[PDB]
Amino acid sequence: HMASMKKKGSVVIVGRINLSGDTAYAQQTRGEEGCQETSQTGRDKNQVEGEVQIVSTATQTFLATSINGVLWTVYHGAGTRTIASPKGPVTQMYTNVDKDLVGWQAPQGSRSLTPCTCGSSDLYLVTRHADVIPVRRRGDSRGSLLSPRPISYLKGSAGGPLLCPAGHAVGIFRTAVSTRGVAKAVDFIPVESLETTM
Numbered sequence: 001h002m003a004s005m006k007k008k009g010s011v012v013i014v015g016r017i018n019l020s021g022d023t024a025y026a027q028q029t030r031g032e033e034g035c036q037e038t039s040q041t042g043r044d045k046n047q048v049e050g051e052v053q054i055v056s057t058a059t060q061t062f063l064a065t066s067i068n069g070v071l072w073t074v075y076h077g078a079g080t081r082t083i084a085s086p087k088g089p090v091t092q093m094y095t096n097v098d099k100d101l102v103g104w105q106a107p108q109g110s111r112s113l114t115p116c117t118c119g120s121s122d123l124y125l126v127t128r129h130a131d132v133i134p135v136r137r138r139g140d141s142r143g144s145l146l147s148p149r150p151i152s153y154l155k156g157s158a159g160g161p162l163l164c165p166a167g168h169a170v171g172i173f174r175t176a177v178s179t180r181g182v183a184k185a186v187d188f189i190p191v192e193s194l195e196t197t198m
């Protein structure tokens with residue numbers, strides 16, 4: 001029993017969504033074999049850049065977003081896992097299963113988004129494929145897609161940001177509201193809920 005019990009690996013940063021220029025695009029920074037090794041050791045010496053990371057476990061891939069010096073993502077992707085870092089695995093600093101939220105100290109080299117104080121309801125969702133999708137805010141934690149899409153297009157983007165027109169963080173993408181496989185709306189953890197957690 002006890003001597004053979006395994007440990008879950010760390011979450012590993014495997015890429016990023018580049019939002020620095022005039023064109024948004026995904027970049028991969030680590031392949032699958034390196035990901036598997038890094039998840040086991042928890043030691044990731046790769047340089048981190050940007051606000052939105054593409055992250056992976058052994059079994060899932062999703063997004064994580066830096067806001068106020070914390071790299072946030074969804075519990076349904078990360079569970080209670082550590083994140084791999086240059087000095088070894090780093091324990092979560094926030095875990096809230098009720099909000100579907102986790103966070104770790106933001107990695108060195110990352111850039112953080114600023115929480116939105118605009119009160120604007122014209123939002124933009126950034127996906128793991130670097131699609132920037134307009135979303136009208138419809139409540140505290142809900143927004144409608146201006147152009148509905150099959151849920152396939154959104155899968156793997158939980159943990160990504162909803163941004164206001166000025167590029168502030170408004171929320172973290174959590175669930176898709178789908179009818180017959182088509183996403184007409186999204187639900188997100190509002191940035192105020194992060195700010196309170198902090």
Ligand SMILES: CC(C)(C)OC(=O)N[C@H]1CCCCC/C=C\[C@@H]2C[C@@]2(C(=O)NS(=O)(=O)C2CC2)NC(=O)[C@@H]2C[C@@H](OC(=O)n3cc4cccc(F)c4c3)CN2C1=O
Binds near residue numbers: 061097100151159173
């Ligand atoms: C709530 C409502 C209205 C009934 O809708 C839905 O339950 N809908 C579904 C539609 C699923 C079809 C794919 C949709 C495409 C993209 C979805 C964004 C996404 C994703 O990309 N994940 S991932 O692939 O990156 C993945 C690798 C990280 N999330 C999901 O699938 C989540 C995961 C699962 O929810 C949860 O486990 N919890 C645990 C929670 C605890 C507290 C609060 C919560 F809300 C919680 C939500 C169901 N999910 C939905 O979205």
Ligand SMILES: [Zn+2]
Binds near residue numbers: 118120164166168
């Ligand atoms: Zn704003």
